[PDB]
């Protein structure tokens, strides 16, 4: 059985690799490439476990990894080497961002032209997510928007549930920036749902954006009622957020302002809520004003000023804007 044969061969390979001495190993692995491929279906298990044993030396041995991936690309052209190759793209690229590896990564252009002008939904989604991440790192909004509209066409794919949640988050941010909150809410809900099952750092970050989008939706239905978001209700990072949600609905002013003032170092830090806070503190005031002047026929402006905790001029401006 040749399977255990090359298993023992790669075993020594790594035994000698602990004693460095690289050129012998590489050349042996190169000459055993074709034999291992033809003899037994290699695909994922053994080569990926070798890469798992090898990434522990990501610092240094960079040339060794580079030549390994070069020979894997130009020798394993038969069969599909792409799926783990975008993993190499994420490893090497997006570590130094704008390095020319980003320009080089477009050698999948033949598959791009084969698909666009399908059935390769997974690879297209993965490359779109990678390009979205790169262009978000470089802060190119037009390119992100173009990528999202181009990705919206694919509806016959089965992706890993982190690739999908990145393009969904990008689309939600684009919708929030443009001004369409209706799609932003559902996009951020989808991004949070996909992040919950797989992921860790950007998990209690899409929930906050989802909350903000729901609060910019003229209220209605507490986001902390679905089974996906309830467990994170008492999280210390999101306690201010759920307090804000509870304050917005059941219209009141003092609690909202107190929450905004107290959590100055936990809410008014990111550039996404620090800018949209002006739309808030105005919708709640408008709702309170509408609810207050319902049973009156002749009301005093200073009374409204006292109720809304703002001066006379702002009350007059708000009334004029509402009437117009």
């Amino acid at each position: 059985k040749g399977e255990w044969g090359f298993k023992a061969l790669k075993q020594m390979i790594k035994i000698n690799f602990k004693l460095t001495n690289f050129p012998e190993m590489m050349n042996r692995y190169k000459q055993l490439l074709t034999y291992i491929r033809s003899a037994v279906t290699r695909n994922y298990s053994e080569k990926s476990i070798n890469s798992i044993l090898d990434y522990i030396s990501t610092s240094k041995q960079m040339d060794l990894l580079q030549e390994f991936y070069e020979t894997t690309l130009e020798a394993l052209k038969d069969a599909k080497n792409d799926r783990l190759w975008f993993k190499t793209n994420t490893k090497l690229g997006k570590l130094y961002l704008e390095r020319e590896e980003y320009g080089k990564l477009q050698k999948i252009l033949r598959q791009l032209h084969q698909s666009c002008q399908l059935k390769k939904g997974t690879q297209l989604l993965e490359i779109y997510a990678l390009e979205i991440q790169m262009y978000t790192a470089q802060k190119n909004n037009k390119k992100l928007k173009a990528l999202y509209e181009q990705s919206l066409h694919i509806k016959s794919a089965i992706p890993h549930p982190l690739i999908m949640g990145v393009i969904r988050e990008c689309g939600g941010k684009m919708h929030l920036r443009e001004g369409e909150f209706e799609k932003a809410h559902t996009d951020f809900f989808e991004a949070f749902k996909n992040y919950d099952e797989s992921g860790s750092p950007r998990r209690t970050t899409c929930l906050k954006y989802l909350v903000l989008a729901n609060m910019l939706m003229k209220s209605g239905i507490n986001p902390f009622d679905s089974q996906e978001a309830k467990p994170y209700k008492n999280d210390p990072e999101i306690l201010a957020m759920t307090n804000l949600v509870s304050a917005y609905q059941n219209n009141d002013i003092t609690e909202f302002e107190k929450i905004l003032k107290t959590n100055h170092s936990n809410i008014m830090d990111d550039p996404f809520i620090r800018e949209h806070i002006e739309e808030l503190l105005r919708n709640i005031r408008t709702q309170v004003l509408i609810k207050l002047i319902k049973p009156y026929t002749r009301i005093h402006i200073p009374f409204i000023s006292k109720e809304l905790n703002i001066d006379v001029a702002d009350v007059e401006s708000l009334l004029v804007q509402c009437i117009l």
Binding site: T186, P223, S226, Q227
Partner: protein, 86 residues
Amino acid sequence: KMFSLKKWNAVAMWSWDVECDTCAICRVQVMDACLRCQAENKQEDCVVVWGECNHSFHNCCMSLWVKQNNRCPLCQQDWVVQRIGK
């Protein structure tokens, strides 16, 4: 290590801790009643409407909601009834 195992592969299945959460529209527990059936004293069917997504509501609650907007109240997805239980 005689008469002992060597390699073990464990398989477990996860599920949500709380299945029926409160109805978002009415804020009162979903599997009790709605606001009007209890008052009018016919609150014995009042059956929940578990949908395709996983969101549960009252039939009386969602009957008024669907007329205006025909999407799920929470995740804004397409609303089709997957299973109704009582």
